[PDB]
A paper describes a structure:
To elucidate the molecular basis for c-di-[name] recognition and binding by the [name] CTD and to gain insight into how this interaction may elicit developmental signaling, we determined structures of the S. venezuelae [name] CTD (residues 80–166) and S. coelicolor [name] CTD (residues 80–167) in complex with c-di-[name]. Three S. venezuelae [name] C-domain-(c-di-[name]) structures and one S. coelicolor [name] C-domain-(c-di-[name]) structure were determined to resolutions of 1.95 Å, 2.33 Å, 1.75 Å, and 2.25 Å, respectively (see Extended Experimental Procedures and Tables S1 and S2). The [name] CTD structures are composed of two (β-α-α) repeats followed by a short C-terminal helix and are similar to the apo form studied by NMR (Kim et al., 2014). The [name] CTD uses a previously unseen mode of c-di-[name] binding in which two noninteracting CTDs are glued together by a c-di-[name] tetramer composed of two interlocked c-di-[name] dimers. The guanine bases wedged between the two motif 2 regions are specified by contacts from residues Arg125 and Asp128. Residue Asp128 makes two hydrogen bonds to the N1 and the exocyclic N2 atoms of the guanine bases on each end (top and bottom layers) of the intercalated dimer, while Arg125 flanks the guanines in the center (middle layers) of the dimer and makes hydrogen bonds to the guanine O6 and N7 atoms. In addition to contacts from Arg114, Asp116 of motif 1 hydrogen bonds to the guanine N1 and N2 atoms in a manner analogous to the contacts from Asp128 of motif 2. While the arginine and aspartic acid residues in [name] motifs 1 and 2 dictate the c-di-[name]-binding arrangement and read the guanine bases, contacts to the c-di-[name] phosphate groups are provided by Lys84 from β1 and Arg130 from α3. Rather, the c-di-[name] molecules are closely spaced and optimally positioned for interbase pairing, leading to the formation of a multistranded, base-stacked structure with top, middle, and bottom layers. There are 12 hydrogen bonds between the two intercalated dimers within the c-di-[name] tetramer, including contacts between the N3 atoms and exocyclic NH2 amides of an adjacent base.
Here, we report that c-di-[name] can assemble into a tetramer that mediates the effective dimerization of a transcription factor, [name], which controls the progression of multicellular differentiation in sporulating actinomycete bacteria. [name] is an 18 kDa [name] consisting of two distinct domains connected by a flexible linker. [name] sits at the top of the regulatory cascade controlling development, serving to repress expression of sporulation genes during vegetative growth (den Hengst et al., 2010). Specifically, structural and biochemical analyses show that the second messenger c-di-[name] activates [name] DNA binding by driving a unique form of dimerization that is mediated by a tetrameric form of c-di-[name].
Residue numbers in the entry:
A (entry chain A): 84 to 155
B (entry chain R): 83 to 155
Write the structure that this text describes.
């Protein structure tokens, strides 16, 4: 389950989190989902984010877990 | 049309017509743990799955769902 902590994500500097921040905003606007605390995404979004980040999905997961943004 | 289904409108649909969609609905709800209201929205791509389960065209399925009042114009 890919579950993002939105309050934490917002405080990661753009230089690390910029593309994930923008990706999450596009999901929120498509959904009209502005709950303010959590955003769960499709497993297939991980694949997409990995392409954007130029990292493997597993390395990306580790990075987001290490930022405390993604639950482990 | 966005597939926003009214599970209560659907319940008033005769079982021969409604069955497959009620079964599918129950499967999505279980996969999600989503049991908190009478509206179920599903993916646009899910219309293909339902088309296959009913062996009806997607367009035909959408039109009838709308007639049963289950789906929004
Ligand atoms: N609980 C749950 N509900 C689901 C799931 N999949 C679809 N739905 C519901 O069905 C809707 C339509 O799904 P869609 O055609 O894929 O249309 C979706 C999709 O194209 C996109 N979208 C929303 N969220 C995500 C996401 O996490 N990842 C991706 N790749 N696209 C998303 O924006 C659309 C509108 O999203 P919504 O307004 O939320 O509306 C969603 C939502 O009510 C699911 O795995 N779990
Ligand atoms: N706004 C929002 N909240 C989130 C998200 N991720 C997790 N949650 C929270 O965590 C629970 C489970 O989320 P879930 O796995 O999406 O699983 C959800 C989801 O599958 C579904 N669900 C609830 N509300 C909606 C809705 O408005 N539209 C759709 N399409 N599905 C919903 O019901 C399941 C259980 O919902 P709850 O336990 O009552 O409540 C939620 C919700 O409090 C997110 O991306 N957006
Ligand atoms: N074909 C189909 N499959 C469905 C539908 N609903 C749920 N599933 C399946 O059940 C898994 C869990 O749904 P979830 O707990 O709501 O957990 C969902 C949920 O919280 C959220 N999500 C994904 N897509 C959407 C979306 O379009 N709208 C919203 N509001 N939430 C979404 O992301 C989580 C993970 O998504 P997935 O990895 O795809 O994992 C999804 C997906 O495989 C559906 O309407 N159609
Ligand atoms: N992954 C996930 N996403 C969530 C959750 N709660 C809300 N959302 C997202 O936040 C959007 C707005 O939810 P809402 O207006 O509060 O209120 C919702 C809700 O009251 C209702 N609704 C429509 N479809 C569904 C559905 O399949 N299940 C549920 N439980 N409610 C739905 O219609 C409004 C819009 O539904 P959506 O188009 O789905 O759009 C939802 C959905 O994208 C959640 O627990 N998990």
């Amino acid at each position: 389950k890919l579950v993002l902590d939105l309050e934490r994500l917002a405080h990661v500097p753009q230089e690390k989190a910029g593309p994930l921040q923008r990706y999450a905003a596009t999901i929120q606007s498509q959904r009209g989902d502005y709950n303010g605390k959590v955003l769960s995404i499709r497993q297939d979004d991980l694949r997409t984010l990995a392409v954007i980040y130029d990292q493997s999905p597993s390395v990306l997961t580790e990075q987001l877990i290490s930022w405390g943004v993604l639950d482990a």
